[PDB]
Amino acid sequence: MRECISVHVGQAGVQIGNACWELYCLEHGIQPDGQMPSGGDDSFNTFFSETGAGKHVPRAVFVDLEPTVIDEVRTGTYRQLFHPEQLITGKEDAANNYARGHYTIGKELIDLVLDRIRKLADQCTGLQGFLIFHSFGGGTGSGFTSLLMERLSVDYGKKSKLEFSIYPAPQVSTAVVEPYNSILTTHTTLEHSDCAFMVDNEAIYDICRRNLDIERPTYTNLNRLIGQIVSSITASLRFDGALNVDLTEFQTNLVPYPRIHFPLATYAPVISAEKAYHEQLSVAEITNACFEPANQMVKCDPRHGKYMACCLLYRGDVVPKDVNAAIATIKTKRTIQFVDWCPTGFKVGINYQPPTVVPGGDLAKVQRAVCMLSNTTAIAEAWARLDHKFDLMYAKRAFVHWYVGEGMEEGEFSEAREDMAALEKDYEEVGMDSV
Amino acid sequence: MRECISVHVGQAGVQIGNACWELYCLEHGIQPDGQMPDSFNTFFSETGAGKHVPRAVFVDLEPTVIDEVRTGTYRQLFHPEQLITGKEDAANNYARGHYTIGKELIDLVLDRIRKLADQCTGLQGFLIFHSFGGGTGSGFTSLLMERLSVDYGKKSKLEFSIYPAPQVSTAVVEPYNSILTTHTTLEHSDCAFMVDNEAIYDICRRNLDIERPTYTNLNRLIGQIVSSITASLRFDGALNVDLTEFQTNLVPYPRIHFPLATYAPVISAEKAYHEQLSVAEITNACFEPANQMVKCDPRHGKYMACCLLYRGDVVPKDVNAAIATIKTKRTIQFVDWCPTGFKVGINYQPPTVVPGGDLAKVQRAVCMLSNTTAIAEAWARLDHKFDLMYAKRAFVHWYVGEGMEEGEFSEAREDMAALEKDYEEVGMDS
Amino acid sequence: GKEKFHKSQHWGFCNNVRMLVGEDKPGIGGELYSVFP
Amino acid sequence: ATNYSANQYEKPFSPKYLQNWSLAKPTKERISSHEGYTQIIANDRGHLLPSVPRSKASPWGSFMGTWQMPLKVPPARATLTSRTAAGAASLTRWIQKNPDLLKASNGLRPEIFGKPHD
Amino acid sequence: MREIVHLQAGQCGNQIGAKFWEVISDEHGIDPTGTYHGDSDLQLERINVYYNEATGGKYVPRAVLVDLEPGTMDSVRSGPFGQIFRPDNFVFGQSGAGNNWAKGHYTEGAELVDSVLDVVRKEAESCDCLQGFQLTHSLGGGTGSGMGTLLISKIREEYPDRIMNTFSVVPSPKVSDTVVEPYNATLSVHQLVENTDETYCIDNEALYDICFRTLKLTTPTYGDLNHLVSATMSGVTTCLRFPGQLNADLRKLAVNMVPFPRLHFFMPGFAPLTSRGSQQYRALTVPELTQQMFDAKNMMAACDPRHGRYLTVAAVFRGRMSMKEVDEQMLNVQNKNSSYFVEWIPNNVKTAVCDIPPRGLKMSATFIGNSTAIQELFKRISEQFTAMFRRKAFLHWYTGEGMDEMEFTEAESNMNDLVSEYQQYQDAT
Amino acid sequence: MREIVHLQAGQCGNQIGAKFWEVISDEHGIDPTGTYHGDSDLQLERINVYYNEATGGKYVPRAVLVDLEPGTMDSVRSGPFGQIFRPDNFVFGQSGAGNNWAKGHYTEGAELVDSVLDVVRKEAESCDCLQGFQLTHSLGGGTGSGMGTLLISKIREEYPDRIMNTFSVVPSPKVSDTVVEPYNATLSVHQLVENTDETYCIDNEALYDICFRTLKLTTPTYGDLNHLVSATMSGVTTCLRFPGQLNADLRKLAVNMVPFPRLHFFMPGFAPLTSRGSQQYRALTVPELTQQMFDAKNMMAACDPRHGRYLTVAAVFRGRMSMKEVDEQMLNVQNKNSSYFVEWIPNNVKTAVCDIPPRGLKMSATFIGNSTAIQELFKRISEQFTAMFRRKAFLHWYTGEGMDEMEFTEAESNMNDLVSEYQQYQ
Amino acid sequence: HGLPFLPGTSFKDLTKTAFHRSQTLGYRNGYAVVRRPTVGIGGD
Ligand SMILES: Nc1nc2c(ncn2[C@@H]2O[C@H](COP(=O)(O)OP(=O)(O)OP(=O)(O)O)[C@@H](O)[C@H]2O)c(=O)[nH]1
Ligand SMILES: Nc1nc2c(ncn2[C@@H]2O[C@H](COP(=O)(O)OP(=O)(O)OP(=O)(O)O)[C@@H](O)[C@H]2O)c(=O)[nH]1
Ligand SMILES: Nc1nc2c(ncn2[C@@H]2O[C@H](COP(=O)(O)OP(=O)(O)O)[C@@H](O)[C@H]2O)c(=O)[nH]1
Ligand SMILES: Nc1nc2c(ncn2[C@@H]2O[C@H](COP(=O)(O)OP(=O)(O)O)[C@@H](O)[C@H]2O)c(=O)[nH]1
Ligand SMILES: [Mg+2]
Ligand SMILES: [Mg+2]
């Protein structure tokens, strides 16, 4: 069982989904034509399925409103892997509008996507939850991923719904009307999301520049690093491990309060081939790189805030004693501050199977790997800067006629910022020590 | 034994029956000259010269589409007696097909049925193909069931009709024909399995990647239904179902006898490789409102009678688990007065694929026949179109002049209004 | 068989009396004058 | 129709075990006994008799489509603990301001399990 | 000298009966043609109870096949064991039943009564001493529920002192195999309760879970379900055919099973039913058989015995076994579970131990339970029949041929009186 | 004769008990296919306590396998001894526990508690005289902590006169393997207090300290940590299975180790465990084994007995040794340091022996000790619990399953009363 | 290498790389099916 359904929405979700689904094929031996060159292994059923004739079809749905991002997949090297009905395109994009992604153009495909998810869920003997890949900045990456989850809450209720969201980076950004979309897609997701793993492009850019010996990284390098995280998350239930971690346990051990569900994901053994020859990668040495601010994959200093919960996922030939001795040294370290109401802080998970490289990629052959998913108070200043972006555009009512003029009341902006301005004191209240 | 006489009327019935009898000859081995290079004796009559002749009559009031049959591949198969041609078409008139020109041809048809009723040891029931929109499809079809009821009575009488499309239409005088043919055949038919044209256009566009279908694709898809309905009279099954079974399980009231047809494994040759076609995954596609072949979502209505006909490598437990899954879904709602809802039909024979067709060779298949409340809005829209026309008297001189009182238009409209009151009075609870 | 499950009609009526009509008929497809070229 | 229970064998046909992970409609557990003949409540052709009381609901159903569904959809997870009283009031008000959604067949079954602070 | 006449009504009883005669012929050594090729001599003395000798050393089954069409009897004879029944025993009509209890009992079944009863008498008058009758049908269809119930009525009005045993297949609780099935069930029960001495409640849902949880069959068919039915029908008649240290035929079983003439609805079960790959995980002993008989999930009726009390239980054990182990195990289950056993009948278990087991097995037993929880079957159909009679659901197919609404009315009263009697002798002290 | 039904829930319980069924099959000679391939007849005479006879000399265990997700069961069934368990004894759910006591005990555990107790009722009346039960799990989990306590209550309400055991894995003192460990531990202990006859408290840290400092083990996995737990389980059940000079079963230990019906949380240990290259430096005598019995670093609970006082002590031995030497050593350890033993009991130590040691060892013993110093284990959880409870740290994942706040206050009060009654005798 | 089954006598194979968990416990159309294990961890 242990089936999982992945939804990729927006251009970002498809491009990450291309690197996610190539890695899942290399972890199982499934060829691009969907044939395994081999009842043997059944570890594929959490991602793949069967048709009797030896064909494995992903348990994924690809939705976009712009056709020329999925049409590569229909005419690429994986054109025979994905089911055609699982790849869904519209006619016109959301044009960097949450209103188009939610009210006018996102309401178009939502009944067809819900229909396709039902046919995918009907094939699942045991469903762990839903994974949704998007970007806060995109039109359909913010609008359609917001409408989908309201419909998933109506249809599937308390089924676990986890997100991999591309945060707008605090200094580097692509779109101009992007802060408007980020506030709107955060407001309507707070009560519907269960947990939201967050990462932005600027912090991966520095990691790709420094930790890896690649100058000028591409989006393809970013999507593989994200794909290694989602693989490391799920492979506890894909592979034999000492401490099994499931998708349902992430919401319990990382979301203390209902309106704060934004932990930060990082992957610390990211080192180049030339640089892996010199240093050893021990369990204590790679887990300290999970806590360095320069190695965080979200551009915010964790020293500015306090850690609320951490979820350590170890992948490889890790020894649980060396895992235990490593966390003990981090607790004795004073520069990392944990809140008083969480004396435990740490959830550890150990998987036996080493990470397998993509042949020709940037990542080196690590014998062991660790992926950290930590909820920090330091994300509050990211909202404070994101408040400085939306508000500095909203005092003059700039770029609202594209939103208010199409299906959306202006009072939406007059309620969606006040609710997430309450997160500022929600993150303040959890960051005060009780006397 | 277990014989079945099939009747086709109108050009719709002939062209559907051409692709139907192409399939019936192909799944029994009958080569298109009548010769075989005892399952055939429900549709075919074996002659003392070795030439198996179809147990059917091709009645049409227009000679043009009939001469395709008299010239094409199935020339030697069909019996020149058993094929009846007209002289002049009804010209989209109920009046002409019922009173003027239909009356001079119906006297020869019942003689043909009578010679066809003497060669059957046990007749299961009739099988009538027509379309609502046409003249001889609506006028002459009415003359059948009025005269077949007085001739036979308790004999089963099943019928297939092409329902008018909800958004497109081939003709303007179509709502006149459809309302007038339902008023007189509401009490003269046992059950009316219904199928649309625009819905199959959507089915042939989404489910199979053959954009731009023609009428041949529609008759082939309809022909798979009629074969699947009568598959159990000819092949062994786990639990067999008759032709007489269909009237008492799908018709709750003598006014409500319009169920909906649905074929689930409507898939091309390129997509059978992509997904498995197990019984649970195809029965869930029967109730899917995008796979239904009448354009009306049953989610907006209620289910009062459903029938499932499986043929192929199916398991009775997988059938049981599929229906119980549908019974747990909140998409599907039933009425208070039908706590059962379902019957099953299972055949061991997998369907026989036709070469030159579009559906792939599937290991198992299911045909779904259900009476729903959602057809009430379809009757509501059709009466709107009749009411917009009959308000200021339009195209009526083309009916009243041709041997037909104008007051029939009234009592047809008075009847049909009650038929909608028959559909909301059955959905309400206590 | 496997692709052929034709059920032959073994029973029937002639002369309005109950009977086995065939007495040499196939089963589910298989078995239970001069020959000219 | 009512989803009956086979008593001892209701467990294998429970909704999630039948691979339907969508808030599925419940099954009946107990049935009472009548004590004689029933009464004809409706004449032929299906019309309910004039005397009998009538239900007050849509005869067709309560399916809420993707366009008649209310905007600003409430959540299904509606716990009220570790939440201020005004915020818990807003969460309760949001769920209770759309009674059409909470009575629909494809509706939202909420779970307000929690007590706010005082 | 103690023979019984077999009845096969409807297509459900035809496939059950064809599998039943295949099981008996395998057990008694009869080949698909009709001759004898058995190894032990204990398969010859009591062939008479089921078969009849024909000149040529060929044994002919004493069964009559009735249906309103020959459609399912085409498949019966095309099967492996379809050459053993006489063609004169096949009785078929002209037109189908339509899942109508009307056509099986009033219009179409009435012309076939004189033909079938003529066959029934000519078997029964060739009998030296007839023991009883044995019918398989279903309560959901038209021929099995209508014609077979009428056959019970015409047999019992001629042979009242003889016993009437039937194995009726009741409608499924969750997924209906017929839309109009609550009518045909209620009309059949109203005359089953008056004109039968033994009846067995076989439900398809219970056979499905038996095939999956216990048999672990990956892809079951109706051939397996009819085999489990046929093993039960062979178990109850074993003392007629094979010698034993404690024998009980149907009447000796029927006398101490039913405490009142209206309380004769049972629940079948098979003891040694195990899987293929877990034969080496379970010992085959007397405590293992009596647990599987008295485990709830091994019933064949889809009604939980823990919701009621067992009036009387039967245990027709087959195999060489020690009687202390049988007697001590029956005492424990009655003692360990005292709330599921009535307290005005001191013992509630009848034990009969034969000597000849089913082939391929060491030990076997057949369970017949007269629980007071089989009212759940009658409660469920009564609600359905209420729901379809209140708003006249399919009455015009029934009242349009001759039945009056009073027939449907008195079917409700008598069947709801049956639930009242079950409830009365469940709360009594 | 004197059978034990083994039940186990959770990932931690299943991995411990799978290793436990490997030590039992090794010393009873049961082969991975489940056949007797041993040497002596004192290896077969008392098989009934754990295994059951099958057709053709096959021995199927009496284990009941419970989890809400069989990913751990799939790992166990693919091991070297995963085929001895009967497939009918595998009962499993469809969704995960989520490290939630509320899901394991109230909502998600309810759909499986009917199927587990049917299997337990299957294996209870199939034996002549059930001696009792045994449960292995971890208190920091969601289904071991949640469902395991639920299965304890359902067994106790039907079988209240038979001893039941709890090999619970208590939370570690310095590093947590789960964020919501104090909530699951507080809610499970509150169940364990009034529902168990014996309870053995095990943590990973002391097993890590035993593996590093006493085994000299460079790479300790979970196979060899569960071996330390499995050796203790075979030690207490030894007199149930093999003959000895002074036999003592489970309840005979429990009678003179539980002085009041509340104090039943013990501390396990394994004396003969030696270092890597230190076997040639080791004398094979009872005094050196005795000084490793009561030695603090040999404890499996990481609660130092120097900080508390021994209420009662159990000492089950294995091998052919004289009993004057054993009794003298138990008298010397009571008399040399009497400040670590309660002055109100003249003899805190029970001596039990057996004549059959495990294979490869000439002489073996297990340590089971009820000390006062286990109260600091409960205080440490309590101070961690009340830190999360005053700010309402993770309650919205618990009260979202219907659970009320007064149970959390109730669970704190029962532990605080258990601390106070331990503190009374010190 | 013939050592007795003691906690210090556990040694793993480092040449093994694939760690694939097969699902021999699952659900068919309503029942908890327990399959016969054909492979172990890693596909061997
Ligand atoms: N890390 C990462 N981020 C990406 C990638 N591609 C796009 N993004 C982010 O996505 C944001 C834009 O959203 P998209 O998903 O690309 O566009 P969209 O969702 O289709 O929105 P519309 O086209 O307006 O409907 C950019 O600001 C990027 O930061 C990628 O490959 N990797
Ligand atoms: N599916 C399908 N429908 C057909 C076909 N041929 C005709 N029809 C239907 O019938 C309509 C054509 O007019 P008909 O109703 O057949 O005319 P008629 O029944 O012969 O009556 P008159 O010609 O007016 O005397 C089309 O719009 C179709 O809806 C066919 O081959 N396939
Ligand atoms: N056990 C078993 N039951 C069957 C079989 N065929 C049909 N049934 C049952 O019979 C019921 C329907 O009865 P039906 O076939 O209409 O009976 P008929 O009208 O007398 O032929 C269904 O509920 C099926 O469960 C079979 O081969 N075996
Ligand atoms: N001694 C030991 N402890 C274990 C083992 N596996 C897990 N644990 C402990 O169990 C705790 C995790 O609980 P877990 O079993 O995952 O909870 P569950 O998923 O609800 O069953 C951790 O603190 C581990 O230290 C094992 O094999 N041996
Ligand atoms: Mg785009
Ligand atoms: Mg024409």
Numbering used by the authors:
A (entry chain LK): 1 to 38, 44 to 440
B (entry chain KK): 1 to 37, 47 to 439
C (entry chain 3P): 2 to 33, 43 to 47
D (entry chain 1P): 2 to 119
E (entry chain KL): 1 to 429
F (entry chain LL): 1 to 426
G (entry chain 3L): 7 to 50
Structure paper excerpt:
Ciliary motility is driven by a microtubule-based supramolecular assembly known as the axoneme, which consists of nine doublet microtubules (DMTs) surrounding a central apparatus of two singlet microtubules. DMTs are patterned into repeating 96-nm units by two rows of dynein arms (outer dynein arms (ODAs) and inner dynein arms (IDAs)), up to three T-shaped mechanoregulatory complexes called radial spokes (RSs), the nexin–dynein regulatory complex (N-DRC) that links neighbouring DMTs and a network of coiled coils that regulates the docking and periodicity of the aforementioned complexes. In addition, the DMT lumen is extensively decorated with microtubule inner proteins (MIPs) that bind in varying multiples of the 8-nm tubulin repeat, but with an overall periodicity of 48 nm that is in coherent register with the external 96-nm repeat. Here we use cryoelectron microscopy, cryoelectron tomography and proteomics to resolve the 96-nm modular repeat of axonemal doublet microtubules (DMTs) from both sperm flagella and epithelial cilia of the oviduct, brain ventricles and respiratory tract.
To shed light on the structural diversity of axonemes across different mammalian motile-ciliated cell types, we used single-particle analysis (SPA) cryo-EM to reconstruct the native 96-nm repeat of DMTs from disintegrated axonemes of sperm flagella (Bos taurus) and epithelial cilia isolated from either the oviduct (B. taurus and Homo sapiens) or brain ventricles (Sus scrofa). We find that sperm DMTs are the most specialized, with epithelial cilia having only minor differences across tissues. Our work demonstrates that the DMTs of multiciliated epithelial cells are almost structurally indistinguishable, with differences restricted to the intraluminal tektin bundle and associated proteins RIBC1/2. The overall similarity of epithelial DMTs reflects the similarity of epithelial cilia in general—they are all approximately 5–10 µm long, consist of an axoneme sheathed by a ciliary membrane and have similar waveform dynamics. Nevertheless, the absence of obvious structural specializations in DMTs from epithelial cilia is somewhat unexpected considering their roles in propelling liquids of very different viscosity, and the different sensitivities of tissues to ciliopathic mutations.
